[PDB]
Design a protein around this ligand. Structure first.
Ligand SMILES: O=C(O)CCCC[C@@H]1SC[C@@H]2NC(=O)N[C@@H]21
Ligand SMILES: O=C(O)CCCC[C@@H]1SC[C@@H]2NC(=O)N[C@@H]21
Ligand code: NA
Lengths: 107, 107
């Protein structure tokens, strides 16, 4: 399996990419100031050539953060460049969706 | 068993949400000016309370658009409000990602 670590120290663990492009994996968040660190969270998404999307549900056996992240990005020159959006359960405005950029490199 | 149509007339068909919150279904794009109209594309994502992510691979046996869209949003007052990001195979810049807002009502 295929591990990718971003600038914050978080790691995407890719367990499979189906011939359909269906991606399955887990994620360990290590980003300072966020909840749900150091423990595995499930990943689903798509790979289409060098394009990728993947999303993480922030609940597991031990810690919940009432939120989901979706990454949209692309593989080029040894890195996956992504834009992410994080939505909190019970939100009432797109104003409350949090966003940023993660760069992932092989680890 | 759960269909949602946006302001552009596109429809998200949620076929199942697992107890894990894993979403599966298909999507029929009817958004003027885009490719991959009128035929079902596959959906994966997560539901967490009122929070939802889903992502469509724009590949099927009928037409392919070499792209992926990821939606991030929430259910509120009977509609799903979403921000989306569309990435194209072979992209080299975050500048080439396209973004928008979709609002879905039950259909
Ligand atoms: O705090 C939460 O609501 C759960 C953890 C969120 C981690 C975010 S997801 C986008 C960014 N990328 C990371 O590697 N960590 C943060
Ligand atoms: O044109 C492509 O690259 C394939 C289809 C993209 C359709 C987009 S996804 C975001 C927006 N919401 C829709 O209902 N359709 C467009
Ligand atoms: Na790949």
């Amino acid at each position: 399996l295929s591990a990718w670590t971003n600038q914050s120290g978080s790691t995407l663990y890719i367990q499979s990419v189906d011939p359909s492009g269906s991606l399955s994996g887990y994620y360990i968040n290590r980003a300072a100031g966020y909840g749900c660190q150091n423990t595995p969270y499930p990943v689903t998404g798509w790979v289409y050539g060098t394009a990728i999307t993947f999303t993480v549900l922030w609940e597991n056996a031990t810690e919940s953060c009432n939120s989901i992240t979706a990454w949209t990005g692309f593989y080029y020159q040894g890195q996956i460049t992504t834009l992410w959006q994080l939505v909190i359960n019970g939100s009432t405005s797109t104003g409350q969706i949090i966003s940023g950029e993660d760069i992932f490199k092989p680890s």
